[PDB]
């Protein structure tokens, strides 16, 4: 017998109502585990059940709710944060048949910042002294901004990632863009990409 | 808490041997063996209870070697390497005596085979310094450290700030990408924003650490250059008014 | 199926 | 604690003379696990005895049972012999054929 | 009907010789199919039943790793159970264990049984409802209160209502030719005499299946027990069960006795004469 994870991927904003299935094979009691894997190092326990209070809390705020009419062990957190952008696995023991784990097809969670004042803008930052290139920084713009990568041969384009000021409540989103041509110039390398016309550049 | 393993990342070419050597936390009488490949979930391999094995996945061959002999610490050992085994080896323990039969990961070790060695290179650093366009519009300064050239994307990235690390205000692609996507190098940037009035004076130091998973000291390097090995390679920049 | 075996 | 082993020697069907058939050795509801049990003919050993495995009763009295492919006639003796820590010599038991 | 299933272990330590001993067979209502021996070069889970033969290598090589986590466990058990006890490291002694569901006409969960004995007297016990131990000794609730704090119960009750009820019904559909047809008994008298006078009658039932059977010899439309020997039932080789009571009478009142031999495969209790 198999369990089954339901949600292969999902992308919410900051601060939503979540929630991961994972469901088992109708007739067995087993124990039930969650784990979650950052893309990096290895998996890390959230909850379990066998003790027989339902409803279980854990570690970052999660819950769980077991349901034998269902045979659903459900991942939950009222409220998610940026930080939890990382795979989910469960994890079942398959009472009978043994003690080794049995894992789930593995759910990819994505998180979206919601954003609340905008300022789209672009910048070319101060080259190092060893290195010969010319970075563009663009950052501080609203989460539904298509990315589309460059075109040319010495010029290369990154995805989007999440800083946290943990400090003065700031969030915002960036991108990076660089070449080390003479010509190649960071007030005119963003184009190849949809932005919006309010787009700050340095004067 | 907590399981530990050694070492984390390696690779290897294919036809020789590899061997891993994990460590569990203390009076854990179960340990667990499981191999996850690239964007699946953890295969199970082999498992342990008190130096003696119980368990070896039948669809696996008798060219992986596992052992516990001294009944705490396990050893993993495979014969002819190939690419089809690349993939995270992780150890897991438990108690037996735990009902609901907890199994606790640790690090893992992630592998790399490939057909020669004709691709290792070290990571070069650069720290580049945000523009005064930003810096007299939001009284924030934006920092962008990078990484160019290395093989393969088993980099560890990092900053410091005074020789203190800090993370709130940093962001870092959780990937990498290929220099030459019809191939390949790897390339990784990473960034780290905070206020204008910490990057006038000059006493903030802005160190970007990149540490680099390389080679090791048994193996063989012919290419006349120097040994790509696992070192940390890092680029500075200092407050400027 | 044999059982689940447990320690004293 | 310790139990005595009760011993009964019989053949799996009527005894019918010349025509191949299996003689059983039941030693039942006895304890310690440690028992020698062999079986004979004539007085000597009978090489291929392959036996049970081992279980017990309700009172954690172990059972066995001693077979071979045996075939009688009017004159052969066929006995069993049981060894045990609980007999202070090796209990031998013959077997009456209608027993 | 009404069918069962067991499990049965036993480990007998041996000072000097090594390892100790560890036999673990696998009980269907009277069925041997699986057996395990600690002694054995091939450390598996053997069959010791033709049906049985049809589960695939996962099934093999589950119960194997679950038996020889046993064989593990409960000899590190052993080592615990001398210091418990206060005896002494170069002695033999020995642990069993027994535990099975038995299911109704429906598979339906009847009863469940949960028993360690050590040396032939209890140690521990599940009650009848699955949650709660009875220790025999001191020397037990110290291991109680082991399986108090780790809920034990709550994971072997959903055994024994769970993985072995549910197991057991695939046991009993993929032999139903053999462990759900009981055969009848076949049934006849003999004579053996003694004295001029005194003779020895014997009521004989061989090969029947179950082994549950009751052999009554009666003199006159009243039972007796006086100069009534009486053997214990036992196995044959294939798979049946044999059993003979006997009786001392004098010349002239054979006509007299009679014996009955009450059966689940007769449906009706035969009544012999001479």
Redesign the interface.
């Known amino acids: 017998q198999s369990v089954t994870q339901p949600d292969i991927h999902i992308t919410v904003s900051e601060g939503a109502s979540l929630e991961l299935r994972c469901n088992y094979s109708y007739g067995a009691t087993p124990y039930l585990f969650w784990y979650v894997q950052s893309p990096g190092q290895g998996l890390q326990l959230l909850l379990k059940y066998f003790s027989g209070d339902t409803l279980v809390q854990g570690i970052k705020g999660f819950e769980a709710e077991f349901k034998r009419s269902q045979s659903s062990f459900n991942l939950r957190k009222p409220s998610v944060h940026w930080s939890d952008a990382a795979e989910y696995f469960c994890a079942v023991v398959f009472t009978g048949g043994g003690n080794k784990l049995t894992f789930g097809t593995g759910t990819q969670l994505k998180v979206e910042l919601n954003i609340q004042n905008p300022d789209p803008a672009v910048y070319q930052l101060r080259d190092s002294k060893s290195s010969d290139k010319s970075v563009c920084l663009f950052t501080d713009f609203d989460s539904q901004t298509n990315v589309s990568q460059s075109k040319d041969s010495d010029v290369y384009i990154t995805d989007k990632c999440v800083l946290d000021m943990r400090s003065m409540d700031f969030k915002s989103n960036s991108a990076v863009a660089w070449s080390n041509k003479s010509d190649f110039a960071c007030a005119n390398a963003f184009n190849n990409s949809i932005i919006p016309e309010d787009t700050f550049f340095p004067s | 808490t907590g399981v530990s393993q050694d070492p984390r990342h390696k690779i290897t070419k294919r036809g020789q041997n590899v061997t891993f050597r994990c460590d569990p936390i203390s009076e854990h009488n179960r340990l667990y063996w499981y191999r996850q490949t690239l964007g699946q979930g953890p295969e199970f391999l082999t498992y342990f209870q008190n130096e003696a094995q119980l368990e070896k996945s039948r669809l696996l061959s008798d060219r992986f070697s596992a052992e516990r002999p001294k009944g705490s610490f396990s050893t993993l050992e495979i014969q002819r390497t190939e690419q089809g085994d690349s993939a995270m080896y992780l150890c897991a323990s438990s108690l037996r005596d735990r009902v609901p039969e907890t199994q606790y990961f640790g690090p893992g070790t992630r592998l790399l085979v490939l057909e020669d060695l004709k691709n290792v290179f070290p990571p070069e650093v650069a720290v580049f310094e945000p523009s005064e366009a930003e810096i007299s519009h939001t009284q924030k300064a934006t920092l962008v450290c990078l990484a160019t050239g290395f093989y393969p994307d088993h980099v560890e990235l990092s900053w410091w700030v005074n020789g203190k690390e800090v993370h709130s205000g940093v962001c870092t692609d959780p990937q990498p990408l290929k220099e030459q996507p019809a191939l390949s190098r790897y390339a990784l940037s990473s960034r780290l924003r905070v206020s204008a009035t910490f990057w006038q004076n000059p006493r903030n130091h802005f160190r970007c650490q990149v540490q680099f998973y390389g080679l090791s000291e048994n193996d063989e390097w012919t290419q006349d250059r120097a040994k790509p090995v696992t070192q940390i390679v890092s680029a500075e920049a200092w407050g400027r008014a | 199926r044999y059982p689940l075996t447990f320690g004293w | 604690?310790?139990?005595t082993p009760?011993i009964?020697v019989?053949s799996?069907?009527?005894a019918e003379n010349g025509k191949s058939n299996?003689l059983?050795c039941?030693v039942?509801?006895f304890?310690?696990?440690?028992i020698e049990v062999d079986l004979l003919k004539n007085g000597e050993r009978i090489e291929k005895v392959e036996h049970?495995?081992?279980?017990?009763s309700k009172d954690?009295?172990?059972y066995l049972?001693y077979?071979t492919e045996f075939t009688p006639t009017e004159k052969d003796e066929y006995a069993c012999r049981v060894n045990h820590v609980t007999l202070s010599q090796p209990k031998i038991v013959k077997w009456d054929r209608?027993? | 009907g009404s069918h069962s299933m067991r499990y049965?272990s036993?480990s007998?330590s041996r000072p000097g010789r090594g390892e100790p001993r560890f036999?673990a067979?696998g009980?269907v209502d009277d069925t041997?199919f699986v057996?395990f021996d600690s002694d054995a070069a091939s450390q598996r889970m053997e069959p010791?039943a033709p049906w049985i033969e049809q589960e695939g290598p996962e099934y093999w090589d589950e119960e194997t790793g679950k038996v020889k986590a046993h064989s593990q466990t409960d000899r590190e058990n052993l080592r615990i159970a001398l210091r418990y006890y206060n005896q002494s490291e170069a002695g033999?002694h020995?642990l069993?264990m027994?535990f099975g569901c038995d299911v109704g006409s429906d598979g339906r969960f009847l009863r469940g049984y949960h028993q360690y004995?050590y040396?032939?007297?209890?140690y521990i016990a599940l009650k009848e409802d699955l949650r709660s131990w009875t220790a025999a000794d001191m020397a037990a609730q110290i291991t109680k209160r082991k399986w108090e704090a780790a809920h034990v119960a709550e994971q072997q009750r959903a055994y024994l209502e769970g993985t072995c009820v549910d197991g057991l019904r695939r046991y009993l559909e993929n032999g139903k030719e053999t462990l759900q047809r009981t055969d009848p008994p076949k049934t006849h008298m003999?004579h053996?005499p003694i004295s001029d006078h005194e003779a020895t009658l014997?009521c004989w039932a061989?090969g029947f299946y179950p082994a549950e059977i009751t052999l009554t010899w009666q003199r006159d439309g009243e039972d007796q027990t006086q100069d009534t020997e009486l053997?214990?039932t036992?196995?044959?080789?294939?798979g049946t069960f044999?059993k003979?009571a006997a009786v001392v009478v004098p010349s002239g009142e054979e006509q007299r006795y009679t014996c009955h031999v009450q059966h689940e495969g007769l449906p009706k209790p035969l009544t012999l004469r001479w």
Do not use: C
């Open positions: 604690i310790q139990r009760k009964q019989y799996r069907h009527p299996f059983n039941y039942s509801g304890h310690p696990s440690d049970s495995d081992l279980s017990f954690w009295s172990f049972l077979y209608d027993m | 049965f036993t007998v036999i067979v009980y041997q057996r010791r033999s020995t069993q027994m004995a040396d032939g007297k209890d003999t053996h014997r061989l053997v214990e036992r196995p044959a080789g294939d044999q003979w």
